[model samples]
Target: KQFAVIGLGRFGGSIVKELHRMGHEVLAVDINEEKVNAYASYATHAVIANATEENELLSLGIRNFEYVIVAIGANIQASTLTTLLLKELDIPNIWVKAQNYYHHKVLEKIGADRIIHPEKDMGVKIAQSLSDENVLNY
Candidate 1:
């Protein structure tokens, strides 16, 4: 499957790398030229484009991808807006990374297909492991 990952932050970059390693076509998009360049070798295509801008995404034919992951960190506004634009584009699957509970709520209202709370989910898993006495390892 083809995957497009926006924002080359830690989370997004990791996803792109894994997808590429799995032999899937991955498009890495980021407004930062340096970030895009860093992932150029890892992605099927890497481009410096603002995901919040509809024209930029459209120009890249973002809708053609089977899945798009919005992993913009810190700037909730940008991430939210980007997810909205992807929804408007009628992309098949839109996965977004939420910075907080409020951000997750906003993404839900924006009609994101999946909202990821990476830190929260990982923390929960660690906590669960700590509470389980019979657990051999995490």
Candidate 2:
């Protein structure tokens, strides 16, 4: 399947690699050239782009991919806007990486198909770790 990861931070970078390892055609896009370069080998294509502008997304043909994952966290506006733009582009499936519960709610309201609260979800895993002795990593 063709996939695109619209950020290349620690979280997005990880996903980019795993998806590529699974033999998927994954396009990794980020503003940080260093970060994109760092994760380039893991995906079919790793490039840079300004995701804040909806028009840029449309020009990029965001809907061509079978699925798209947005892992942008630094700028919530851009992340949210990018997801909204993806919906506008009419991609069938969109997975958004949200910052918090509130962010997820807003994303849902803005038309994200799936919401991923990385920090908060990891918080749950951390809490579980605190309670379980067998847990070593969250």
Top candidate when judged by TM-score against the true structure: 1
Model 1 bad stretches (over 4 Å): 128-138
Give me the displacement of residue 16 in model 1, in angstroms.
0.5
In the range 13-60, model 1's lDDT, one tens digit per residue, is 999999988898999999989999999999999999989889998999
TM-score on alpha carbons, each prediction = 0.92, 0.84
Clashing pairs in 2: none
How many steric clashes does model 1 contain?
Answer: 0
RMSD vs true structure, all candidates: 1.9, 3.4
The lDDT for every candidate, in the order shown, is 0.92, 0.84
Candidate 2 lDDT by residue in tens digits, 1-138: 879999888888889889888888888898879988888899888877888777667666767897899998778888888888788778888999988667879998988888887777889988887778665543
Top candidate on lDDT is 1
What's the C-alpha lDDT at position 82 in model 1?
A: 93
